[PDB]
From a paper:
We provide crystallographic evidence that acP can bind to substrate and co-factor binding sites and that acP-dependent acetylation of key lysine residues of the central metabolic enzymes triosephosphate isomerase (TpiA) and glyceraldehyde-3-phosphate dehydrogenase (GapA) could alter their function. We used a high-throughput peptide array technology to determine if acP-dependent acetylation of susceptible lysines could occur in a non-enzymatic manner and x-ray crystallography to both confirm acP-dependent lysine acetylation of specific proteins and to examine the molecular environment of susceptible lysines. Taken together, these crystallographic results confirm the hypothesis that acP can acetylate lysine residues in the absence of an acetyltransferase. Finally, we propose that acP-dependent acetylation can be both non-enzymatic and specific, with specificity determined by the local three-dimensional (3D) environment that surrounds the substrate lysine residue, as well as by its solvent accessibility and pKa.
The enzyme crystallized with four tetramers in the asymmetric unit and had either NAD+ or pyrophosphate bound in the NAD+-binding site. Not all molecules in the asymmetric unit had the same residues modified or ligands bound (for more information). Front and back views of the protein are shown and NAD+ (shown with sticks) is bound at the active site pocket. Phosphate is present in the non-acetylated form and binds in the same location as the acetyl group of the acetylated residue. The protein with the non-acetylated lysine and phosphate bound is shown in orange, the protein with the acetylated lysine is in teal, oxygen atoms are in red and nitrogens are in blue. Acetylation also could inhibit enzyme activity by interfering with the binding of co-factors, allosteric effectors or protein-protein interactions. Our data suggest that it can inhibit enzymatic activity by acetylating key lysine residues in active sites, allosteric sites, or cofactor-binding sites. One major consequence of overflow metabolism is the conversion of acCoA to acP, accumulation of which would cause acetylation of the glycolytic enzymes that convert carbon to acCoA and thus to acP.
Residue numbers in the entry: 1 to 331
The structure:
């Protein structure tokens, strides 16, 4: 009904999740933790290069934050066991620091008073992952879950539809992805990912992403049938997937369009979108759907070998689904 949420990590996702929460009445952010002074969090919230100025009022009082007349407890604990979430009545924690993606590390929020935790990234251990449009129904009361990755949220719903209707024998996917915080402005160090340390604005950078393989986990029926890679390009936000699949049942492109459009207007409304316009990436900046099929962009070699294209706002879509998952596990 009215779920109290605590955000750990006020980075890109933390902040977009925060903004999306203002527009929902069933969820309230009541606390934020990060290694930042309240006055600086206020700044990061008020102004955003990609999504413009915060629609609302934000002031600082007594080292805490006041957003639209509500107190938000601001803390700067490095170790999550000290967060004392129960003091501000937190039901669920959105773990968004990118550092606690295992059960033992995330479990600390529960030790600190929170009832459940939602990792805003794919889990490094086998913490179960949930993707709206793919397997929310599979949630089974676990107290710690993952909302997977932004790319998986784009791919899973589309793949599910395609597979349910025509059967995916095998597929390879590519995502042309926007630049992110892990990259560098100019050629710099990235010991675990050499290419990733190259100047982001000057290059097309190949990168790895198990996101395609991870679909196998949220959609068991596709386990071992998909995999892929990514190219990081110089745009600040919004990415796109290029799924190339081989189908069991023959289907004309017109039939595929109809299948997706049906899903978008029906069962997967709000998750999977459909467009026939001449769109470009900026047209999805701010998009809430996690996957928006681009009918005109895709191409079919034949009734059984097709290349499908779907857009996604890697910050906004995912952030909204984090909230959707929080709401879902709180039923
Ligand atoms: Cl806003
Ligand atoms: Cl999983
Ligand atoms: Cl679902
Ligand atoms: Cl469901
Ligand atoms: Na709210």
């Amino acid at each position: 009904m009215t779920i109290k949420v605590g955000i750990n990590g006020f980075g890109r996702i933390g902040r977009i999740v925060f903004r999306a929460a203002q527009k929902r009445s069933d969820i309230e952010i009541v606390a934020i933790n990060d290694l930042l002074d309240a006055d600086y969090m206020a700044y990061m919230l008020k102004y955003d290069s990609t999504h413009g100025r915060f629609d609302g009022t934000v002031e600082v009082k007594d080292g805490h934050l006041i957003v639209n007349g509500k107190k938000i407890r601001v803390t700067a604990e490095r170790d999550p066991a000290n967060l004392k979430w129960d003091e501000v009545g937190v039901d669920v924690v959105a773990e968004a620091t990118g550092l606690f993606l295992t059960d033992e590390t995330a479990r600390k929020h529960i030790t600190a008073g929170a009832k459940k935790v939602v990792m805003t990234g794919p889990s490094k251990d086998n913490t179960p992952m949930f993707v709206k449009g793919a397997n929310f129904d599979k949630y089974a009361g676990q107290d710690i879950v993952s909302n997977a990755s932004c790319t998986t949220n784009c791919l899973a719903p589309l793949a599910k539809v395609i597979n349910d209707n025509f059967g995916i024998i095998e597929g390879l996917m590519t995502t042309v992805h926007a630049t992110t915080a892990t990259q560098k402005t100019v050629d710099g160090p990235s010991h675990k990912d050499w290419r990733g340390g190259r100047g982001a604005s000057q290059n097309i950078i190949p990168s790895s992403t198990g996101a395609a393989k991870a679909v196998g986990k949220v959609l068991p029926e596709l386990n071992g049938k998909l995999t892929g890679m990514a190219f990081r390009v110089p745009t600040p936000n919004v990415s796109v997937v290029d799924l190339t699949v081989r189908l069991e049942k023959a289907a004309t492109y017109e039939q595929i369009k109809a299948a997706v459009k049906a899903a978008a207007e029906g069962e997967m409304k709000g998750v999977l979108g459909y467009t026939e316009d001449d769109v470009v990436s900026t047209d999805f900046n701010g998009e809430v759907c996690t996957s928006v099929f681009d009918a005109k962009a895709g191409i079919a070699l034949n009734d059984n070998f097709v290349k499908l294209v779907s857009w996604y706002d890697n910050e906004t879509g995912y952030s909204n689904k984090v909230l959707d998952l929080i709401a879902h596990i709180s039923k």
